């Protein structure tokens, strides 16, 4: 839970930023997937007039 670190910018900052970006993108993609699944399963279906 404490990914926040930093020292020796030139390469460590770049790599840590890339990995944090990958992590947040994965989290956002999975949240989008979950929200899409929720909207799909909660969408009421038509039955008859």
């Amino acid at each position: 839970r404490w990914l926040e670190l930093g020292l020796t910018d030139e390469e460590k900052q770049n790599q840590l930023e890339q990995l944090a970006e990958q992590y947040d993108e994965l989290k956002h993609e999975f949240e989008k997937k979950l929200e899409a699944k929720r909207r799909k399963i909660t969408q009421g279906d038509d039955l008859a007039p």
Partner: protein
């Protein structure tokens, strides 16, 4: 690309930029729609975006980074950030953030921040180690904000007169008591120009609440810095939104050891707005005003203070009287003595069409020996004793003549000796 360079340019610049980007006829859409389309076209070439926005949070958990183009409202240009970033980098409302952002990705519709670069013009290190606003200790002002320009033009009078009428200090709680159509607009224009010329270090802030668009554009092209405004094209929702946005921005700045000076006009309209939005708690008093509805304006006037270690938050708000609205009357009554600086303008002198129109005996500052030096204070005492027996129109003409033969205040001082 950077978002601010799309911010500072007018609409025709966006038109020619979109024409450079080979875009459809874009004269029909909003400026923010044009900026969105141009940023999408730029990122389609495999480019990242650089943005800057003031942060705002709802109970929904996630945050929105607004720009000053819409005076901090929702729009296609604002950036969406997850609550995770707010939890990590210790973000909060009013914290202006600048950094890398990307256009909305597959299924998204607003921008998203990638990497923070400047948190209130500061690295995240000391931004996370920020002292809390209400946890601070208020003080009084010794740093005197000199209102005199020194050039001594035709209008500089209205500034230099304050140097002998109402001293201004950092973090002062000032309120203007004035009837409509008296000269407050040009007055605040003068004060903004003077503080920017004499003190360019302190970030300037002006509050245009419930005003006409002509005044909006005239003040956004005359103040010597970034400004915010709000007309009556939207209901009190926009007004309360911009009030919270500006108050949290000023709070975060003064927490970052900044010197903020907000100019609010007019405060009665803010009170009307806060009344209109807040539901009735079941008790109303005379004037059709709810009891605890004024709590938000109260707070907004109480945010002014003087930080001990460094920084200050001065608030100079104008109030409307003599409008005939008894509601407004009661409002001013609630604002009887909440501030330590009073600027009283009277319609009687302004009807004689001389400017400015100062109520010297009615205006003043509480605990003013802590602002200026001893000789200046003694000369202020002498001037007050000389101006008390005479009336107001004759006194105003006397002051105007005395400050018309002379330019700096030392000449008038020695002439009064």
């Amino acid at each position: 690309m950077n978002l601010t360079e799309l911010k500072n340019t007018p609409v025709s610049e966006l038109i020619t930029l979109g024409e450079n980007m080979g875009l459809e006829n874009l004269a029909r859409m909003r400026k923010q729609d044009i900026i969105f389309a141009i940023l999408k076209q730029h990122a389609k070439s495999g480019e990242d975006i650089f943005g800057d926005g003031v942060l705002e949070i709802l109970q929904d958990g996630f945050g929105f980074l607004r720009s000053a183009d819409s005076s901090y409202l929702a729009g296609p240009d604002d950036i969406y950030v997850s609550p995770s970033q707010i939890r990590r980098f210790n973000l909060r409302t009013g914290d202006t953030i600048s950094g890398k952002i990307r256009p909305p990705k597959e299924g998204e519709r607003y921008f998203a921040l990638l990497k923070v670069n400047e948190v209130n013009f500061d690295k995240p290190e000391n931004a996370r180690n920020k002292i809390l606003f209400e946890n601070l200790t208020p003080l009084h002002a010794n740093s005197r904000l000199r209102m005199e320009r020194g050039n001594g033009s035709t209008e500089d009078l209205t500034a230099r007169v304050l140097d002998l009428a109402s001293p201004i200090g950092r973090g002062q709680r000032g309120l203007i008591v004035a009837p409509p159509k008296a000269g407050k607009t040009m007055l605040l224009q003068n004060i903004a120009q003077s503080i920017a010329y004499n003190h360019p270090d302190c970030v300037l802030m002006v509050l245009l609440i419930d005003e006409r668009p002509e005044e909006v554009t005239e003040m956004q092209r005359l103040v010597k810095g970034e400004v915010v405004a709000s007309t009556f094209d939207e209901p009190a929702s926009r007004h309360v939104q911009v009030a919270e946005m500006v108050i949290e921005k000023a709070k975060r700045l003064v927490e970052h050891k900044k010197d903020v000076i907000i100019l609010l006009d007019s405060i009665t309209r803010l009170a009307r707005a806060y009344n209109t939005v807040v539901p009735a708690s079941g008790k109303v008093l005379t004037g059709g005003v709810d009891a605890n509805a004024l709590h938000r304006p109260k707070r907004f006037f109480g945010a002014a203070r003087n930080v001990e270690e460094g920084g200050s938050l001065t608030i100079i708000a104008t109030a409307l009287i003599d409008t005939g609205s008894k509601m407004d009357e009661v409002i001013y009554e609630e604002f009887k003595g909440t501030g330590n600086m009073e600027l009283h303008l009277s319609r009687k002198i302004a009807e004689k069409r001389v400017f400015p129109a100062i109520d010297y005996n009615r205006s003043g500052t509480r605990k003013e020996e802590l602002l200026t030096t001893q000789e200046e204070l003694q000369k202020m005492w002498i001037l007050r004793k000389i101006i008390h027996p005479m009336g107001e129109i004759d006194a105003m003409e006397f002051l105007i003549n005395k400050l018309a033969m002379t330019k700096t205040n030392d000449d008038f001082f020695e002439m009064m000796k």
